[PDB]
Amino acid sequence: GPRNVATIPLGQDLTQPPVAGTGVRVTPPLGSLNGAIDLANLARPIAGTT
Amino acid sequence: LATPSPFDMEKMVWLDVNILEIRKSVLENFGVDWSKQIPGPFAAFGKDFV
Incomplete structure (x- = not known):
């Protein structure tokens, strides 16, 4: 499955929360x-397959 | 000194015409129609060595 991580966008102030x-x-x-x-509302680590 | 007739009496003809036609047709459309092309599996890889 995919991984969920915290990221800081480029060009953003450093003090802002991730x-x-x-x-x-x-x-x-x-x-x-x-x-x-x-697909828009799908939780990517898919819970509920069928 | 003889003269011709103004016109000649012709025989008269009666025509009787018959046109007969019959058309018949049957049409049926039954069963279950399924999808025949569906998405397949996917795989992706990504890495940053340096």
Whole structure:
């Protein structure tokens, strides 16, 4: 699975709190299933497979 | 000294025409149609040696 890490964006003030970031993470292209499976709201370390 | 008739009396002809037509058709569309192209597995790797 992907990793969830804390990252600081480039060009941001150093005192500002970090934000959420990831390791290598793939969002596959849903060819004919596009719009049928929700990817925006999916928790990437997938809990609930079926 | 003889003269011709103004015109000649022709025989009269009666025509009787019959046109008959019958069309028939059947159309059926039944069963279950499934998806035949679905996304496949994915893999990705990333590293920073230096």
